[PDB]
Amino acid sequence: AIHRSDFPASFLFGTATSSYQIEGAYLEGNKSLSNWDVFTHLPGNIKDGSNGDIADDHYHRYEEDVELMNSLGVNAYRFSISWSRILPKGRFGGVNPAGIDFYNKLIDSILLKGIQPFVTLTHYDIPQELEDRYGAWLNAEIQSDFGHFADVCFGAFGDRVKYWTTFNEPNVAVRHGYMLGTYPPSRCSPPFGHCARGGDSHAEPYVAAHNVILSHATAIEIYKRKYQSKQRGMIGMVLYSTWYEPLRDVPEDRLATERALAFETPWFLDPLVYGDYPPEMRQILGGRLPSFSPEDRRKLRYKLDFIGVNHYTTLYARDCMFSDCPQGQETQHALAAVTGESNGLPIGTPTAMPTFYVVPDGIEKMVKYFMRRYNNLPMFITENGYAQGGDSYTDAEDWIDDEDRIEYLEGYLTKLAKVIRDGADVRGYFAWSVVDNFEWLFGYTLRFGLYYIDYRTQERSPKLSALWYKEFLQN
């Protein structure tokens, strides 16, 4: 139904991964332990008790994986840099040459094939030492550690990297880390949970996000002052971007939907474009959102060059400001509750990933929301994809037969082409993911790959969706 010629000639088409999810070699090349290395070696977090010690062994097998994505006909590859490989002990501990060498080799390998790097600096990971030393995102010192990490990466790689992302889904990582306590550093308080480390779910998430925002600001100021004129790249941020519809078409749910939306991506994007937190959030949270100092505001004037849209799903939102709702969900402070069901029944076909429903027009509506709120600031679809999982899959052939993924990709790409025809400045699309990999708390139980991975042998095998994406990119 949809074809490559339905998109602009200069459009990026790629796949996306992250370092912890694919690399393995978790203690090789003088790399230090990350937050996720430490976390996954504790019990009671990952669904299948797995970890990323080995993952897809991409640290050793990257050349094969580059060859595979090249065989699909991609012109870009979205990946992240392991902080713990570059600055194992943070900014006073010296740059790790083996880490620099690994990413130089990866970058050179993709560019040899005409595949453009689209690089995420941080994608949930930090060296554990930064948590241990000063509590990572709860201390403003992280801004300097992140700034230094950015500076090193720009200097080492930026002659060949023209697209950078500071952070991947900090809206997810912050709320899971400090509100629900289900991600490291596993901090929370009632009514969200009882976290043995302590926490404050009504304060700490907002401090953490504040420091993420200002870490971005620190990094992009460095980029614009030191590197932009020579390197001519763009610096963005990637946000988890769910579309929301009112459960009932009445003002209270419409307003709740607008709150649900404003509490997600604008939490980060309003500061980076307008210099203040969303007024929807400020009205409710007041002083729980920290202020931006004059020094902060100087850095915020560098803004961001693009919005990285990680869009997978669409949900209904309903009001909790004037109705009593269950407490302790991540949407609590927004005074909305979200659900995939209306009168018991799904918004679109359910999938193996909780909250992920097949709702293609969500990508159009999400893009239009950014267009209206941010005056059509450039966007890239930095992740979109479909997970397989569960008892229907006993062997490779079952995973390979992924017509369900094809239908998803086809539908969402159809709607993306439409929103671009309608004026949206979307400049690329990245399928999550080229390979099955470690899906955070779900471990290996969810498989998002265009390629199937046998974790016993590390064999890569193309699923039907790999063949489909190749056909699509051939036009």
Author numbering: 26 to 500
Question: What text appears in the publication on this structure?
Answer:
Rice Os4BGlu18 is a monolignol β-glucosidase which exhibited high substrate specificity for the monolignol glucosides, coniferin (kcat/Km, 31.9 mM-1s-1), syringin (kcat/Km, 24.0 mM-1s-1), and p-coumaryl alcohol glucoside (kcat/Km, 1.4 mM-1s-1). The Os4BGlu18 structures exhibited the typical (β/α)8 TIM barrel found in other known structures of GH1 β-glucosidases. The general acid/base for catalysis is Glu194, which is located in the conserved TFNEP motif found in strand β4 of the barrel. The nucleophile residue, Glu408, is present in the ITENG motif at the C-terminal end of strand β7, consistent with Os4BGlu18 following the double displacement mechanism described for GH1.
Single crystals of Os4BGlu18 and its complex with DG yielded X-ray diffraction datasets with 1.7 and 2.1 Å resolution, respectively. The two protein molecules are linked by a single metal ion, which was best modeled by zinc, as seen in rice Os3BGlu7 (BGlu1) and Os4BGlu12 GH1 structures. This Zn2+ ion was evidentally a minor contaminant in the sodium chloride used in the protein solution, as was also likely in the Os3BGlu7 and Os4BGlu12 structures. A glycerol molecule from the cryoprotectant formed hydrogen bonds to the catalytic residues E194 (acid/base) and E408 (nucleophile), and other residues around the active site cleft, including Q46, N193, E464, and W465. The distance between the delta carbon atoms of the E194 and E408 was measured at 5.3 Å, similar to the distance between acid/base and nucleophile in other GH1 structures. In addition, a MES molecule from the crystallization buffer was observed at the entrance of the active site pocket of the native Os4BGlu18 structure, although it had no direct polar interactions with the surrounding amino acid residues. One disulfide bond in loop B is conserved for plant GH1 enzymes, which was found between C213 and C220 in Os4BGlu18, and another disulfide bond was found in loop C (C345 to C350). Therefore, the natural substrates were docked into the Os4BGlu18 structure, in order to check the interactions of Os4BGlu18 with coniferin, p-coumaryl alcohol glucoside, and syringin ligands. Strong binding energies were displayed against these ligands with the ΔG of -8.80, -8.33, and -7.63 kcal/mol, respectively. At the entrance of the catalytic cleft of Os4BGlu18 are found several amino acid residues with hydrophobic side chains, including Y149, V197, Y208, Y265, M378, F381, W465, L466 and F473, which further maintain the ligand in the aglycone binding site through pi-pi and hydrophobic interactions.
